[PDB]
Amino acid sequence: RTQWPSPAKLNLFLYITGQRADGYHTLQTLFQFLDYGDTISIELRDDGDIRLLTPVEGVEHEDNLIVRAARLLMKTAADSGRLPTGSGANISIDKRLPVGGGLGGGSSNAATVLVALNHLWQCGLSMDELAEMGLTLGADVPVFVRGHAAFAEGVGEILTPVDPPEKWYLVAHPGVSIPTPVIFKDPELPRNTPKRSIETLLKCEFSNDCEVIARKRFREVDAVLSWLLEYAPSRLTGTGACVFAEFDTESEARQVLEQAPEWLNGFVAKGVNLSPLHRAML
Ligand SMILES: C[C@](O)(CO)[C@H](O)COP(=O)(O)OP(=O)(O)OC[C@H]1O[C@@H](n2ccc(N)nc2=O)[C@H](O)[C@@H]1O
Numbered sequence: 001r002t003q004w005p006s007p008a009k010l011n012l013f014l015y016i017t018g019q020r021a022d023g024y025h026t027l028q029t030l031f032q033f034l035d036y037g038d039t040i041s042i043e044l045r046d047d048g049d050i051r052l053l054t055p056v057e058g059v060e061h062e063d064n065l066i067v068r069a070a071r072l073l074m075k076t077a078a079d080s081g082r083l084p085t086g087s088g089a090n091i092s093i094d095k096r097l098p099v100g101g102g103l104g105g106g107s108s109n110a111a112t113v114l115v116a117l118n119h120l121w122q123c124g125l126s127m128d129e130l131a132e133m134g135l136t137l138g139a140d141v142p143v144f145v146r147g148h149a150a151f152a153e154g155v156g157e158i159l160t161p162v163d164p165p166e167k168w169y170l171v172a173h174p175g176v177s178i179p180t181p182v183i184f185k186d187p188e189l190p191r192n193t194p195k196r197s198i199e200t201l202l203k204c205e206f207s208n209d210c211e212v213i214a215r216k217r218f219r220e221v222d223a224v225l226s227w228l229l230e231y232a233p234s235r236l237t238g239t240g241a242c243v244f245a246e247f248d249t250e251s252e253a254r255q256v257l258e259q260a261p262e263w264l265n266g267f268v269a270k271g272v273n274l275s276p277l278h279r280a281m282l
């Protein structure tokens, strides 16, 4: 049996620059990982099956991104003779990231399964191939597949590795579930933010174009943001509902957490420019 990290990510900033006709939004964002997330364990099968043994709450087996990732890799490899006969796996996950919470846990789960099973089945697919397969599963899957903090354009797949400061974060989950489509279809969502350079973006104040909508429509996001902004710079990540505050040291971040009311649903973790997954792969 093998164990594989599946880390969370933050959008240190997130700007919506436009929208293409397929419905998706063009953006400029800065991904960083957290040294914190799910653990996925794999045991190879020889009967060619794929079984997710640990269900994820509210997700059907065949709807689970873990299974979809594994089956997508199995089909691609077999279509091109890269799948040893009988390849399969029993997969289990210890999920720490709230489902749909905003940290991209499902996105990260798919990436880890692609990278791990590519290694275990000895499919030999390249990073570009894996990341290309990941993109069909989710716009956030490629960053996790490629394993480094990155400036992202396109829908999230045009990735330029960068090395942001690995600050400490208090990550809080408001008590509400924000479906990603709700934010992205909101008429008031900024979709005209001017496309700028990484040097302009690295100097300008970091913000999240989705925040004004999240905080306005979901009072529990506004409550959590208001509490944290009294202590440190705080922003929405992804489309929410998750919110994080930035700190320079573990002690400060943990002191604010010790004070935080339970409805923050908070934890503290350090940013990591190298994905714990790719770190464990070395
Ligand atoms: C907002 C971010 O979290 C920033 O990292 C990502 O761009 C979202 O990507 P994601 O979590 O993988 O969500 P997906 O499963 O890929 O897409 C869900 C839906 O969100 C909307 N969506 C997502 C990404 C994007 N660049 N433009 C969009 O309009 C689409 O309606 C899509 O049907």
Ligand SMILES: Nc1ncnc2c1ncn2[C@@H]1O[C@H](COP(=O)(O)OP(=O)(O)O)[C@@H](O)[C@H]1O
Residues within 6 Å of the ligand: 056, 058, 059, 063, 064, 065, 066, 098, 099, 100, 101, 102, 103, 104, 105, 106, 107, 108, 109, 110, 180, 238, 239, 240, 241
């Ligand atoms: N392994 C998984 N973990 C979490 N969610 C999953 C998984 N597989 C499928 N999903 C589904 O996809 C969504 C999870 O999105 P996720 O990336 O966790 O959201 P966010 O990016 O807001 O954190 C939910 O609709 C859930 O039903």
Ligand SMILES: [Mg+2]
Residues within 6 Å of the ligand: 104, 107, 140, 180
């Ligand atoms: Mg997502």
